[PDB]
Amino acid sequence: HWGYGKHNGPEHWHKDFPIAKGERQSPVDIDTHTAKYDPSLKPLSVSYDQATSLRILNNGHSFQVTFDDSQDKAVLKGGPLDGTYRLLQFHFHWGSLDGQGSEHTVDKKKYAAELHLVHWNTKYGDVGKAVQQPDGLAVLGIFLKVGSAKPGLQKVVDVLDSIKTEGKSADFTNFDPRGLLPESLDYWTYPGSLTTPPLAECVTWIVLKEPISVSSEQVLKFRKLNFNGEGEPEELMVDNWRPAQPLKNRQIKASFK
Ligand SMILES: CCCC(=O)Nc1nnc(S(N)(=O)=O)s1
Ligand SMILES: CCCC(=O)Nc1nnc(S(N)(=O)=O)s1
Ligand SMILES: [Zn+2]
Numbered sequence: 154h155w156g157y158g159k160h161n162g163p164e165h166w167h168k169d170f171p172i173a174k175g176e177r178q179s180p181v182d183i184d185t186h187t188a189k190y191d192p193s194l195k196p197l198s199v200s201y202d203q204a205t206s207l208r209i210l211n212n213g214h215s216f217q218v219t220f221d222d223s224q225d226k227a228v229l230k231g232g233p234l235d236g237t238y239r240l241l242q243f244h245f246h247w248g249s250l251d252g253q254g255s256e257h258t259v260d261k262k263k264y265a266a267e268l269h270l271v272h273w274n275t276k277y278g279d280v281g282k283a284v285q286q287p288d289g290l291a292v293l294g295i296f297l298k299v300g301s302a303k304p305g306l307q308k309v310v311d312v313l314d315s316i317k318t319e320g321k322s323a324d325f326t327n328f329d330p331r332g333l334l335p336e337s338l339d340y341w342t343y344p345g346s347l348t349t350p351p352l353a354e355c356v357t358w359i360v361l362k363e364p365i366s367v368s369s370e371q372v373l374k375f376r377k378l379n380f381n382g383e384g385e386p387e388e389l390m391v392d393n394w395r396p397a398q399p400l401k402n403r404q405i406k407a408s409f410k
Contacts (some may be wrong), residue, residue: 155350156214156380158388163395170352177354178398179345180256180294181405188341188405197338197359197408198231199293199331204240206328209312213319213380214349214393217244218309218328222273222280227330229272229291232359232408233342238272238291241280243330245269246348247375249391251299256348256394257360259296264364265372266297267394268333269348284353287344294360295335302368305332310374318383335363339409348395362409 155161155169167173204227209218219242220227227240247266248254255264270293273283283289297303308328315323338361345358378390 157393166350166352170350172346172352172354175346175352175354176401177344177346177403178352179348179356179358180258180395180397181343181345181400181403182258182261182397183341183360183405185260185407188407190410191406191408194233194342194406194408195231197229197340199229199334199338201227201240201329201331203227204328204330206325206330208322209309209316209325210322211316211319211378211390213382215244215246215390216313216316216375216378217242218325218330225275229270229293229359232340233357233406234291235288237275239275240330241271241273243268243270243333245297245375246394247297247372247391248394249376249389251369251372253392254394255296256397257294257296257358258397264296265299266367266375268295268297268365269293270295270330284347284351284355286355288357289355290347291357291359294358295333296361296364297367297372298364299369299372300366302371303333303365305329306365306367306371310371313374313378317377318379318381318385320382333365335361335365337361337363339363339407341405341407343403343405362407
């Protein structure tokens with residue numbers, strides 16, 4: 154089964170998910186000098202006031218916080234998007250050290266981690282149907298650098314000891330994802346894919362320019378998670394990021410000058 158190890162990592166994924174060598178794979182390097190400012194791009198609309206978080210889960214490749222997506226409660230609209238996208242879950246990708254961990258890079262710069270808020274287009278009714286559509290998902294990507302703590306992240310970090318190993322989950326209600334957002338909603342956008350299997354080419358990527366700062370203590374708690382299930386040889390959940398993929402016939406657009 155797929156993972157991030159020597160023998161099952163991103164370089165192996167194409168064997169089970171041949172779309173890994175496709176025409177709109179993610180992540181990519183964002184060359185800031187080649188991204189073109191698009192004045193037609195609308196401001197992003199992030200409406201998270203009524204978000205209902207449900208559970209936090211270790212799925213063996215990341216940890217994710219899941220939300221109630223049975224109603225327009227936490228929605229993403231505007232920006233490059235047509236229509237309304239419901240927040241399904243967020244999760245992170247991080248490194249073994251602070252110089253790696255993000256999936257997207259900015260002028261080849263890797264960040265310590267990358268937060269992905271995954272949303273699906275309500276015109277497709279459910280996420281499984283949306284993953285089959287070229288405009289089915291919108292993932293909001295936010296870079297994490299190490300410095301000052303992010304207070305809005307602390308409730309996440311403090312529960313990770315209860316989901317150390319693959320398959321553990323816990324109630325995680327009343328978490329407000331607005332506490333994970335940077336000040337600016339300036340973004341880059343491009344058509345891409347899921348960055349984990351099945352690597353489906355269904356994502357409008359919206360990557361924020363402004364990183365959030367998290368503390369070394371906060372990221373160290375990410376790195377104490379395990380890829381393995383309980384009772385298995387302990388393999389620390391670190392470096393769960395896919396490297397940048399060929400841009401091919403794609404243009405990255407910037408919402409800002
Ligand atoms: C689509 C069903 C649930 C889901 O969210 N699957 C994802 N697979 N990769 C994602 S990423 N790293 O691009 O945000 S999300
Ligand atoms: C537009 C949604 C679907 C998509 O974009 N891509 C894929 N269709 N089959 C794939 S496999 N077996 O490689 O994972 S991927
Ligand atoms: Zn992700």
